[model samples]
Target: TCPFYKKIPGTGFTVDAFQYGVVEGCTAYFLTHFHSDHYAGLSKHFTFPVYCSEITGNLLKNKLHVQEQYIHPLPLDTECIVNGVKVVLLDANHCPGAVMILFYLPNGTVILHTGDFRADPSMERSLLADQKVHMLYLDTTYCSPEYTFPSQQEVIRFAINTAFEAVTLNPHALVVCGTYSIGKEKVFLAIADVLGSKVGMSQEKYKTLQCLNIPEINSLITTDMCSSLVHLLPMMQINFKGLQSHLKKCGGKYNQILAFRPTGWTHSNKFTRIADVIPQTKGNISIYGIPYSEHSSYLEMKRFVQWLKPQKIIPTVNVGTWKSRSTMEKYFREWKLEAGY
Candidate 1:
């Protein structure tokens, strides 16, 4: 359903979309990362090869209940061939197994599909070396100026401190962190390590974490909200619509329960970030949102685009881009040397 369905400028393989024979002879299917958006409508009943990172493959196997034979492991930063196309999987920096796909076509067009990535200093130098990136499938999730967020490390500090403060002020209150199925595990792990408390998630999420075999994730026990002071609830656990039935159950058990989500939305102009907490009210719980996003901020995206300087960039989101590519290109390319020498 996404543009990832398009044929590799010259190749006959399909990277991130379904719909068999979209390219007449396209039989290959490649996945840049394991985010669910990229996997929506994917079925275990498929009969073709699905290419992805080892971590992403792990996710497909465990999370989606796909058979092992159907998922092939693509190593990070390594080149592999699928139907004669030179496909290289590089870290997307969005999550544990996320990757940005580089397709070096026979026609000499090097197209980069940035599958939900946050460009950091480490990836900048090598990403654009020697190759002319003709087209970029960019993930401009936070493309607007309103999304001009600080570095993730800064937001992480804010999250940890805010959670600590919540616990300190209301010593009996349980601190619940909202996260996703596979993403933001680090937030819970860090909070648990720092606060000397084991983070908890549902039994379902526990299975996904165990497959990764992350050493620190061992600190996360069952979702025993009754006992665990710090809880890790999945995304959409609480929202404008309000808390779920189980969450309402928590209101009965605890007097003061503060649940917070670490998200890019904290930097949204719609919200107010006072100290580490973008405080909000409405639900039966005291909730806060930390501006800890995996995506690159507007400034980071600006630098990333300028460094790569692709001829044309298209947003990777399924819905659409906030601003026109031409608009953002002008916005990003406006960075100039002060001396102009």
Candidate 2:
């Protein structure tokens, strides 16, 4: 079972474990990203020293109002130390401020803890390739063959080009892109950049955007609903009825609604290619389920494991039952044997 704080055995630090309160001897708390699940239990009262990417630290302070002294923002591809452990942070490629942490214990053990990263080929060229890892704390979110999806760039290209066609035909259409508290900024921002349109969002969402420190993004956001043709809203409010109601609220300022719901749930082996996945339409509202996942795909996970070839692996997701964990274990076993480990 995954422990509450996800403590690394033999280390005095906990990663993303603010929820468990103060562990007996947890000298430090590490946050991989600002995602709710990872930073769950963190509050304004959190006192332990928290280490994370600079952007994550900024978000924690701005969004959660966490005390400034308790936060430590680490630069990527650099080394630091805490309680006799050498630590480094690497870009996770999942979301802004997301990172993969590497820990070097005094006992000559190298642990690569992937804190929810999208496995990309660029990772192979990092310092991680130079070390021999003794253990790997992997993010197994999509640890099955069926979960394979296309590259994020390909899906984004499809989205931009397709949306271009839609708007070209209907010059007065309003494009709506869905998002969560964080993540998937690329899809909407890229769409807005290419369409040469401003992105509309609620005033509340605008505050969080300011914390990200991306000048380009900050300059593109607007609170006025009618200022731009592209609008960013919570994914839950992007359904047929939701869009219809939103359209009505606009008072006919826009004609048709082109909405995009970006998530991994929309893709599977059932589709031959990214474009093969179809969109759902109802009453002039088209909902395209873009296969834009922030988590590592199955094949990418396999590639990551093979590249590292750690002596042992501890999954950080889907560990509630032996059945689910075993399914991943089989794949690990096969890979280990194939590598002659």
Candidate 3:
């Protein structure tokens, strides 16, 4: 069974529960990252103790305006105590402030809550290798067999190279990259650096980036629209209709727009190279759905599960229905058999 809205079965600590309100048995709250979906219900009025990595704590305090007294910033790559429970926070490899939580309960049970992660080979040698994990609270966002994509670096390279050639070949075309508030920063940032162009964003968006403290971020951002041919926008607005309106407002300063919509949902077995996924174009605007995911691929997840060999898994994503949850567990069983356990 899933942990009932991301709560550890035998403990009072809850992970990413700002939206769930006061969970009936919850005593302490833990945040994995600053993403809106995970940190949705948290508010300044809430009084519960919130534990997270230092960057997440900072985002909670500055961006969400949570109370400082209740925010507990823990050190990464080390064990710490919180209300008698031993805890360790490791990089989730998902976003800037995301983390995978390790809980050591009193009954000798070890649980791993990977808030949202992209499993990497380096994790095989991390502290997790030496321990026995009883229950794994996995991200499971890309648990299906068809979700595998290329490496993040490869995808970034594709985005950068694509944008560079597209804009250079068509001098008046503006490259607009879709972005979330936190994830995909690397994509747009790398594109700007490679194109030798400044990044433009709204005043409010600029404020949010300031909280991140990303190096070169200050120098890269510009308020003037003409100062930068490249712009970062929310993912939803990168569509044909949206980009059409955005280009219309520019009054012919830029005649065309090349937008990159980066997400995991675009990937499938049908596409081999990240470039193989075709772009959807209408008029002068073309929208490329790049397979740039922050979550682990299906194969990557299988590798991690085989290596770690956790006793049980609780799917944190795609758990809306019993059928979906059971399907994910079926994959776990096959993985166990493959590992010869």
Candidate 4:
């Protein structure tokens, strides 16, 4: 029931997929990445030019068999034009090919569709540097005070340390990390590098990474499980109901196991920043969900809006509309806080 594609009305281009046929009437299109939800209803038959990162372009041409002409690789920071709209793609910092689209309107209005990203200020203009935004389509996955997890770097370090200890404590064991079919390659590769092993990924996972053409992470993939001490499995296969069955055969498989889920669900907090690791155990298996998220937290999004100072705020996941300054004050009380001021 969700309409996957959105348009700027006056401007003709649409971002992401068609969702339904009518949205296709837009003159141009943009894609953030290869994630299923974002690319809903997209296929090879799509006729218009699709602006996206090079990796996303490869995924479309190779996996979906979309013709090359329809795929425009808008690498980070490059400027292009669509129906008089000046466009630039910035790193979304969500997945390999994910991008935050910035549109410079002919009337001096700037629009930003964040796609799905963690909002790293370091990569702003070069990637995420400051910009004047008139409209912001935000990723509100954790837009409430309920979410406040550690940084990806810190969480990854914790997971690796836990996995290291799990392996050291158990004689026969294998490490499996739960990641989306196409994302979190960084986490998997880091573990593989430290374990001195290759990452065994499924066919689709391999293709996703292969087509992304990321050199550092690509070299870490291996089709052979025997060659890999660490195996990267799709999140669906590593969940509570799924991995439980797989781990039940420990005696015949591995005597013990260490499992990790890298996601924002690792901790439940409000405003306070939590940076510690918590682990759970069942039989010989130890489990932990490290905060490795692709979406920005509430605070992060607030900061993003504050910096961009857009004129309109439209959430990607919810129903809301506001002008730039009011949206900032509405959500974060931009001026000052109760006592935190």
- Cα RMSD (angstroms) for every candidate in the order listed: 3.6, 1.7, 2.2, 4.1
lDDT of 4 by residue, 83-143 (tens): 7778888878887788888888777777888898887677544633555666778786676
Best by lDDT: 2
lDDT of each: 0.69, 0.86, 0.84, 0.71
Quick one: best TM-score, which candidate?
2
Q: Can you write out model 1's per-residue Cα lDDT over 1-341, one digit (the tens) per residue? A: 33543556677666667643343565677777666656765677776778888887887887777888888887776778877778888888887788888989897888898888988877776645767888888887776677766666766677778768767776666667777756767667766666778777777877777777576566556667676777776668656444544455665555565666766655253454445344676544667666667888777877777777777676655334434555565554554232121
Candidate ranking (TM-score, best to worst): 2, 3, 4, 1
| lDDT, candidate 2, 198-290, per-residue tens | 899998788888778687665788888788889988889989988898998887788899999888744354566777767898878999888
| Alpha-carbon deviation at 189 in model 3, angstroms | 0.7
- Model 1 off-target regions past 4 Å? 1-5, 19-23, 223-225, 239-254, 266-278, 281-284, 318-326, 332-341
| Per-residue lDDT of 97 in model 3 | 78
> Where is model 2 more than 4 Å wrong at Cα?
1-5, 267-269
Between candidates 2 and 4, name the one with more favorable TM-score.
2
Q: Which pairs of residues have clashing backbones in candidate 1? A: none
